[PDB]
């Protein structure tokens with residue numbers, strides 16, 4: 072027979088899946104869009120290369136912070152579930 | 157045997173996952189898109205570097221406010237669940 | 242055991258989650274896209290850019306109204322739940 | 327113990343959340359994409375400004391009609407739930 | 412005590428929300444994208460204004476047909492639910 | 497109390513909803529994107545545009561076939577439910 | 582009263598709806614984006630028409646293979662459900 | 667009367683549908699985007715045809731690997747379900 | 752009848768599904784977008800293209816790390832389920 076934590080943990084795993092699924096959508100498309108501009112800018116001005124890598128890494132850093140903060144809360148959700156009985 | 161808060165807490169965790177999962181989609185894609193204009197603009201005109209960071213950080217400011225306001229409401233949902241019995 | 246409001250509040254948290262999740266996806270990406278144009282236009286026409294912040298704030302105003310109307314209805318769902326028993 | 331309206335109302339709130347979540351995604355990204363073209367067109371031809379505002383407001387009007395019609399049905403779903411017992 | 416139509420009606424309302432929530436994503440983003448070409452085209456060549464509204468309204472016609480055909484099926488789902496017992 | 501078809505019909509309405517929701521997202525946005533090209537190409541080359549309506553209708557034909565095949569399977573799910581008991 | 586296949590079949594129909602909903606999103610937007618480049622390339626070089634139709638049909642073929650393979654598994658899910666009891 | 671594998675199998679089928687539904691979104695849109703550059707590039711310079719197929723198939727290789735690795739895990743979920751009792 | 756792990760494993764398969772679904776959406780589309788730039792840049796600058804594969808593989812590296820970290824957590828959810836009883 073069920074118990075309250077079976078329901079709480081099921082919610083937690085779905086909740087955690089939503090957090091990382093959305094995190095990977097944000098990060099994969101975000102990084103690809105940042106890389107796109109990098110590849111294009113180099114293609115247009117192949118000596119611009121040096122000055123493009125700082126704006127690129129700032130963008131990626133922002134994108135990846137969302138992925139990583141999401142990851143941390145997915146870890147909280149399934150390894151230390153808030154509201155667990 | 158199930159109790160009311162088990163069900164409410166499972167809903168809270170799924171809602172909190174929706175909130176953060178949508179926040180990361182918006183943040184990563186929004187920031188990548190902004191970053192794509194920054195990188196391209198710098199590639200097109202290297203001395204516009206400083207000029208371009210101002211509208212970039214205004215833009216990133218707005219995208220990031222959506223992410224962290226969502227983060228606050230996810231924390232309300234899972235740490236101070238409204239409707240908990 | 243369960244009671245009706247456990248199920249209703251669970252639906253409310255999940256619906257509130259969809260509402261904020263969707264709101265930040267529209268907001269992050271809508272503002273990113275608006276800011277991309279702002280950044281590019283400032284890169285292209287540094288002088289006559291003041292004429293650009295005004296269409297930008299209008300766009301951002303529309304995008305943010307969607308985010309905050311959604312937020313208002315999330316609050317209603319989870320703090321004044323319609324159909325609560 | 328549960329009752330049929332607890333299940334119906336839970337469905338209604340999720341249903342309503344889906345309607346507004348999707349409404350905000352459509353409206354935020356739609357408006358941002360319309361604003362993008364507005365900001366760009368002004369940047370390219372800063373006297374085009376006058377003739378751009380009619381096509382802009384037609385686009386936004388279309389985008390916002392979807393948001394508003396969605397909002398109306400979310401209101402029906404949770405305040406006058408069809409099929410309520 | 413639950414009855415069959417409570418469950419069926421809850422499914423109907425979630426399905427109807429999916430239908431309209433996806434309709435608004437498609438309508439708002441589709442119409443914004445069409446509107447972006449209209450605005451840009453008018454900005455590029457002001458006297459193409461009349462010429463450009465024809466393919467724009469054909470395009471908006473198609474996007475809007477998806478939105479209102481979805482709206483009809485959402486109404487079938489929630490007002491004349493198939494499978495109701 | 498519940499019977500098996502209540503649960504099956506509920507799954508059917510939710511699955512039918514996903515099918516139409518997804519179909520209108522692909523259709524709204526696919527047609528918007530096709531029409532964006534049509535509008536721009538007519539703006540750029542008003543004379544030789546007749547050659548454009550033909551690739552446009554092919555694209556729209558493909559996009560609409562996805563919408564209407566989906567519609568056909570939504571109808572099957574909700575009017576001739578596979579696995580109904 | 583329920584039976585195991587009522588739950589299995591409900592899962593199957595939702596599962597099947599997810600497969601086709603996502604299939605139509607992939608195919609509608611994919612085909613529209615392929616058609617966009619076709620319409621644009623013809624508009625820019627109206628004699629390029631001949632050499633554009635092979636890359637166009639390769640792209641569409643790839644896009645449509647995802648739709649069709651998804652369709653086949655949705656057919657498996659709801660007409661020959663794996664794990665049916 | 668329900669048994670454990672009925673619930674587990676229903677979860678398996680929904681998870682397997684998520685997996686393939688997300689795979690087709692990524693594959694169709696990813697392949698359309700790659701194909702859009704191929705078509706445009708060939709339109710811009712007809713004799714670059716052979717040159718452009720190499721980076722196109724590398725790109726399509728990567729997009730398609732996501733689709734078929736997802737397909738393998740969907741098959742694991744529904745044909746060899748982990749956790750089946 | 753049911754047992755707690757039936758419900759937990761079901762949540763695990765659904766969460767694992769969200770995680771892989773999201774991962775392939777980010778990966779398909781992120782790599783498509785990166786490859787679009789690669790293809791265009793090679794079409795525009797055939798000589799100095801070697802400088803492009805290096806930003807391309809960096810972008811793809813970031814996009815694929817998101818896909819494969821997600822895959823790693825899907826495996827954890829479905830093969831070493833956190834909170835399993």
Ligand SMILES: COc1nc2ccc(I)cc2cc1[C@@H](c1ccccc1)[C@@](O)(CCN(C)C)c1cccc2ccccc12
Nearest residue numbers: 303304306307310353386387388390391392393394395397
């Ligand atoms: C631009 O505004 C519109 N344009 C439309 C265009 C077509 C149609 I058919 C309906 C339209 C409706 C409106 C607004 C409206 C104005 C007055 C009354 C109701 C609705 C609006 O929906 C806009 C929301 N978006 C910005 C996301 C709104 C709703 C709810 C709260 C608001 C609060 C503040 C401002 C706007 C609010």
Ligand SMILES: COc1nc2ccc(I)cc2cc1[C@@H](c1ccccc1)[C@@](O)(CCN(C)C)c1cccc2ccccc12
Nearest residue numbers: 558559561562565608641642643645646647648649650652
């Ligand atoms: C362009 O068509 C294709 N190209 C493919 C390319 C690769 C692969 I591996 C499979 C492909 C399959 C097809 C079709 C097909 C033709 C014949 C038989 C089965 C499938 C199709 O799937 C296209 C659907 N899209 C437009 C969204 C289809 C399915 C179902 C009903 C249809 C009804 C009418 C027309 C097409 C229908």
Ligand SMILES: COc1nc2ccc(I)cc2cc1[C@@H](c1ccccc1)[C@@](O)(CCN(C)C)c1cccc2ccccc12
Nearest residue numbers: 098131132133135136137138139140142813814816817820
């Ligand atoms: C580029 O990497 C980063 N940039 C960041 C930027 C801002 C912030 I605030 C956090 C950041 C965190 C990281 C990584 C990290 C490095 C070390 C330790 C933890 C996290 C990372 O999250 C990147 C994942 N993406 C590629 C999707 C990661 C997580 C998990 C497993 C990884 C395995 C291999 C490589 C990277 C891994």
